[PDB]
Copies of this chain bind each other. A is one copy, B any other.
């Protein structure tokens, strides 16, 4: 069924931040499968325990963007998440109108892997044909962005999108009001904001933005939405300015607004992709597939020169993720002579740009890591940099490389891994079991605070220790106990 596929997707696949489909933002050690929908029903049914704080906090995760900026992905506390996912499942026949929207490019969809939200998933041919087809006969292309979107979505506006603003205000139960309550329970009983990364917040965002899409559609606008980005194709500048006005009205009705540093009108014909994308692909040494693998295999100077050219292009343009695109272009066709050189270049690029650390997972088997302890000092210097810059995805990926490849990790860099206080980093140090006593000091400092929001901020670490019998639950409810009795592990093996 599609209800069952959504129920699997909300918990087994898209609970953790898993929207990016090329490389994940979270290392593959953390997996949210075995958190089955029946365990979510049992958690929702459980009513024990008393909480002194309204709502639940989230395990935080600062992922690095192309400009090294942090984006705070969140792992919802699972007692607050099981109710939210179960509510979205039970109400799916009244929610699936977001699937029938045609202006939302990334939306819930029955993906084969098990997910429902995968950004940048559709193939290049259809994307090109759509871009030309919608750019047919038009003069201007308007790009608009919602300012926060994740930051300031109003949860009380979830019924406003569903049955209208004034009908919902008069009505103040309906399914969308309980959805608003359950979404609020996900993040500290707070009206504004949604945790970034779970598909439940993507569904909540799609529900609110589908009314905006409906009103923009009914006024005859050619437009597409990519999460919070609206692209409009306009025969004249009348359409260009009036779409911006109507989008501003429709967002302001649901308390949202437009990012005016991201608004720009560009005369068609522009570029189907961004300009740096075609600059890289035109100069890519892999741009032609030769149908024989020896020809497809690249040389040392070819890959290195393309990587230098990508570095200059990112310094000179910087409009997008130039390094990640360029590295994905050359990463899978490396010859054995290249692997050490491109590996060290990736070490250089991963230090300077910590979002490039996941690509280091491709080469680690082919590179002989023992060497003369060069890579040993490299990964620790990266770990120190990720501790310094407060970057969670680079820290977690580097620690996944350190435990998976058994490379030792220094004490002084751990002094800042423990002091940074990223939860997912501390779960990796927790799964190592060598640093049991520095982990114990941190969790004891959390418990001695007697602040439930900090325990909810480190619920993944606390649950991993409780499931590994190294600690008891810090909660008086049965949620951790129902998780552990059924075998829920958020750091599972194969």
Interface residues of A (CB under 8 A from B): 52, 67, 69-70, 151-152, 166, 169-170, 172, 188, 190-193, 245, 248-249, 252, 257, 260-261, 388, 390, 449-451, 454
Contacts and interface: CB of A to CB of B under 8 A. Distances in A.
A264 to B, nearest CB: 13
Given A190-B191, A261-B261, A166 B390 contact: no
Contacts of A166: 449
A87 B245 CA distance: 42
A70 B192 CA distance: 20
A3 B135 CA distance: 64
Nearest to A67: B260
Given A191-B190, A192-B190, A169 B388 contact: no
Contacts of A69: 260
Contact of A188 (B169, B191, B249): B191
B450 A170 contact: yes
Contacts of A451: 169-170, 172
A277 B403 CA distance: 56
A152 B276 CA distance: 34
A252 B421 CA distance: 12
Given A70-B257, A169-B449, A249-B390, 11 more contacts: A67-B260, A169-B451, A170-B451, A172-B450, A172-B451, A188-B191, A190-B191, A190-B192, A245-B388, A248-B390, A252-B390
A152 B193 CA distance: 11
B260 A169 contact: no
B151 A449 contact: no
Contacts of A249: 390
27 contacts: A52-B172, A67-B260, A69-B260, A70-B257, A151-B151, A151-B152, A166-B449, A169-B449, A169-B450, A169-B451, A169-B454, A170-B449, A170-B450, A170-B451, A172-B450, A172-B451, A188-B191, A190-B190, A190-B191, A190-B192, A192-B192, A192-B193, A245-B388, A248-B390, A249-B390, A252-B390, A261-B261
Q: Which 6 A-B pairs have the closest CB atoms?
A: A169-B451, A169-B449, A69-B260, A190-B191, A192-B192, A166-B449
Contacts of A70: 257
Nearest to A68: B260
A312 to B, nearest CB: 22
A36 to B, nearest CB: 34
A33 to B, nearest CB: 32
Contacts of A261: 261
Contacts of A454: 169
A67 B449 CA distance: 46
A166 B445 CA distance: 10
A152 to B, nearest CB: 7
Contacts of A52: 172
Contacts of A449: 166, 169-170
Contacts of A188: 191
Contacts of A193: 192
A157 to B, nearest CB: 12
Nearest to A188: B191
Nearest to A451: B169
Contacts of A169: 449-451, 454
A53 to B, nearest CB: 8
Contacts of A245: 388
A384 to B, nearest CB: 13
A316 B450 CA distance: 56
Contacts of A67: 260
A181 to B, nearest CB: 14
